[PDB]
């Protein structure tokens, strides 16, 4: 459980002398808030895609993502410094990292470390190390801190089938939950597993990664009303407009074909994109709390990976578990999905596929114009709130659909 | 910059304002020194000054 070497990876500046955001946004961030933990920035992404995403400091659900992860960044620095900093703006409420405080007056001592792009190693600084209880909450956060930061992409999102032995326990539960999105199951899980510092029981766990993988199978075309998890797939409600809100559904059908065993993936979004779309990011959240639990194969090898972020301790490698990650343009897949079907026969293209594939254009479209522009500002200003991205990042390709075939062969 | 081809310009040459620039300056090894390189305990906090 205590995974020891509990490095997490802080995010890099886009050709910046800063840390991204300003000033007046860190401001915001810290002080307008006060915990350290992730319960305010749930309860905006909780809303089950209503309000608009937008704001003058946060563009989208994603936006707040990265200015979340670039605050822990910078602001760990301090705390995490070898022999303790902290001061301009937060010098920390208590050395257990209580609250976000605005400089403890007769305190200047502990300067304002200046880093780089530094990846940090939670348990070699004694104070943390000591606090190993208290350290697992956000240790949660760190992950996901990481999994974005990692990357230059949309979230890297891991996935697990295990084949075979299945809880029976685990079926009669989630079956109660059928009726909800995806979300809020996750707010929950994600809850729980802060909540309790984190433990060896698989439940939770094996749960968790069930749902993921349904979720996947679902989104990609393996997974829907006809070829089911023995009743299990997620349907994707509201044919029209692009948002079409995955629930968790339990209709029998078929069971699909037990696959050989264990089945893992990861995917990246390579489209930005991923920003206005919340199943994408709930997939990336849970895979996160999954790794609190368990030592996932050392992560995806610098192969599709900025040169920063190369090289990193024991994490990217070159022959290791997953040493390709698997990469998709959302707009493509939602099309994959609906050849899968035709192919299956479950539905006409006629009128079905036509639509949905004019109103996810449409969708995309909209998406585009906006992150475009948004990002206008932050690249032109000092500031950074949003996702550092060129319009050829829009692109059609990033192996779209070997992702795709390759989620499927893995439901064999 | 003035028309130099113009009147009320002054022609004097004065011991006080003997003509120089700067030829050449010293370059001497000795010279170039001043001094300290700049170090760092190891790299970790305050504790490695050895």
Known sequence: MAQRQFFGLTYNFYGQP??????????????????????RFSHLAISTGSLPVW??????????????????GAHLNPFAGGQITS?????WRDPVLSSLAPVPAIQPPPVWAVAENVL??????????????????????????????????????????????????TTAALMAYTGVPIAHLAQTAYRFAGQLPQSPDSTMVSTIRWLSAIWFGSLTGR?????????????????????????????????????????????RCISPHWQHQIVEVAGALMSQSVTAVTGLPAL?????????????????????????????????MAAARHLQWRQDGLITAAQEAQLNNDYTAYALTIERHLTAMLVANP???????????????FGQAGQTAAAVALAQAMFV | ????????????????????????????????????????????????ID
């Open chain 2, 1 to 48: 910059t003035y028309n130099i081809t113009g009147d009320g310009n002054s022609f004097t040459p004065t011991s006080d304002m003997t003509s120089t620039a700067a030829p050449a300056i010293d370059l001497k090894p000795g010279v170039l020194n001043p001094t300290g390189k700049l170090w760092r305990p190891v790299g970790t906090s305050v504790a490695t």
């Open chain 1, 120 to 169: 940090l190693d939670s348990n070699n600084y004694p104070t943390y190390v000591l606090n190993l209880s208290s350290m697992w909450p956000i240790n949660q956060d760190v992950h996901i801190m990481t999994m974005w930061a990692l990357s230059d992409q949309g979230p890297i999102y891991h996935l697990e089938v295990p084949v075979d032995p299945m809880p029976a326990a």
């Open chain 1, 300 to 332: 995806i090898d610098e192969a599709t990976l900025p040169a920063w972020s190369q090289g990193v301790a024991n994490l990217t490698g070159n022959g290791q578990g997953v040493v390709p990650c698997l990469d998709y343009n959302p707009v493509p």
């Open chain 1, 379 to 393: 690249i032109a200003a000092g500031r950074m709130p949003i996702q550092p991205f060129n319009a050829a990042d």
């Open chain 1, 87 to 91: 001061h301009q703006g937060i010098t």
């Open chain 1, 55 to 72: 704001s003058a400091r946060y563009p989208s659900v994603a936006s707040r993502n990265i200015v979340v992860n670039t605050l822990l």
């Open chain 1, 223 to 267: 997974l829907n009303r006809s070829r089911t998890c023995n009743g299990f797939y997620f349907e994707f409600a509201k044919p029209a407009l692009n948002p079409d809100q995955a629930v968790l559904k339990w209709n029998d059908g078929a069971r699909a074909a037990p696959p050989a065993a264990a089945q893992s993936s990861y995917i």
């Open chain 1, 18 to 39: 800063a840390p991204l955001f300003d000033l007046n946004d860190l401001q915001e961030l810290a002080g307008c808030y006060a915990r350290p933990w992730t319960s």
